[PDB]
Every structure is written in C-alpha cells, then in structure tokens.
From a paper:
In order to get an atomic view of a conformation of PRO/DUB not constrained by the crystal-induced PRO:PRO interaction, we generated a recombinant mutant harbouring deletion of the five C-terminal residues (hereafter ΔC5), corresponding to residues 728–874 of the TYMV 206K polyprotein. The ΔC5 crystal contains two molecules per asymmetric unit, hereafter referred to as molecules 'A' and 'B'. Clear electron density is present for residues 730–874 of molecule 'A', and 732–874 of molecule 'B'. Both molecules have their C-termini far from the catalytic sites of other molecules in the crystal packing. We thus have two independent views of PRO/DUB not engaged as a substrate in a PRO:PRO complex. Superimposition of molecules 'A' and 'B' of the ΔC5 mutant with the WT (engaged) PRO/DUB shows that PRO/DUB retains the same conformation in all three environments, with the exception of loop 864–868. In molecule 'B', Pro866 at the tip of the loop moves by 9 Å to a position overhanging the catalytic cleft. In fact, in molecule 'B', the mobility of this loop leads to the closure of a hydrophobic zipper between Pro866 and Pro867 on one side, and Leu820 and Leu781 across the catalytic cleft on the other side. His869 and Cys783 also come significantly closer together. However, it is clear that, in this closed conformation, His869 is now close enough to abstract a proton from Cys783. In summary, the crystal structure of ΔC5 indicates that, while TYMV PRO/DUB is a rigid molecule, it harbours a very mobile loop, 864-TGPPS-868, that can shift the GPP flap at its tip with its atypical double cis-proline, from an "open" state where it can be recognized by another PRO molecule, to two other states: a "closed" one where it forms half of a hydrophobic zipper, and an "intermediate" one, halfway in between.
Numbering used by the authors: 730 to 874
The structure:
C-alpha cells in the first residue's frame, strides 16, 4: 500500500503509482492484481535472463513460448525495478510476475501451491495452464499439476 521508492524513481516508467489491475484492466481473480506498479514507457533494455528462472521455464513448458520471449514481454509491461532487484535475485520471480505474463499472453493459470490451488491471470482468456508451486524454502515453480 505504501509507495516503494525504487518504483517512483524508476526512469523506465511514467506516471503515478497504481495497482496493476488499474493500469492494465482485465478480469483478474480478486486480490491478485492489486500490487502497485507504474506504466512502462521506455523500450526494453534487454535485461539478462534471471538466474532463478523456474517461473519462466514452467510457463514456457505450458505455453510453448520461449523463456526469452516471456522475459522480453515482462519488460514491455513492468518497470525494470520490478524485474531485477534484490528479491528477484534471491527468491526468483513471483505470482505477480505470473499475473503480468498472464495478461501479456492471455492465459489463466491454476497454481497448485502447498496451500491448495489458486487462480492467477485474467478470466477473459481462452488459454489455460497448470503450474505447481512449493514454498520450500526455496520457492520453486514447476509446470503441470
């Protein structure tokens, strides 16, 4: 809810800090797309692929989209500060990145977590995928049920 300084300082973005679902309206499952972000304006800087890439490999398996294309798509819609930071380098990508990918590639994911299945991504979509998540630690995403 509070405004993150790296986000407001991020020169790849413009405008005010708003929930993802306000800046990118879709039929998201409630309380999944409320995370704060800013509109991405600068073209891609071609960030290196994340070292902890299991979310990309899992979504890639289920969509047949390369991890490179998934990652470049994330750079179309999210500020760089939300893609390369202390958290992504030590914990990997998160279900918030999954929500962003779900918008960019029009799918809804069922995430089979240690707490049960949870939907991420817009309902106004045709494509469905299955992703497994274990808390660990470490966090791990895998494709399929």
């Amino acid at each position: 809810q509070l405004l993150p300084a790296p986000l407001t300082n991020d020169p790849t973005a413009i405008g005010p800090v708003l929930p993802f679902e306000e800046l990118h309206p879709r039929r998201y499952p409630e309380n999944t797309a409320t995370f704060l972000t800013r509109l991405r304006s600068l073209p891609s800087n071609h960030l290196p692929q994340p070292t902890l890439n299991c979310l990309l490999s899992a979504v890639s398996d289920q969509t047949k989209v390369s991890e490179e294309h998934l990652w470049e798509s994330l750079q179309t819609i999210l500020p760089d500060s939300q893609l390369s930071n202390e958290e992504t380098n030590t914990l990997g990508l998160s279900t918030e990145h999954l929500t962003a990918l779900a918008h960019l590639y029009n799918f809804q994911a069922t995430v089979y977590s240690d707490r049960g299945p949870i939907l991420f991504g817009p309902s106004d979509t045709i494509k469905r995928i299955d992703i497994t998540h274990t808390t660990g630690p470490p966090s791990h995403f895998s494709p399929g049920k």
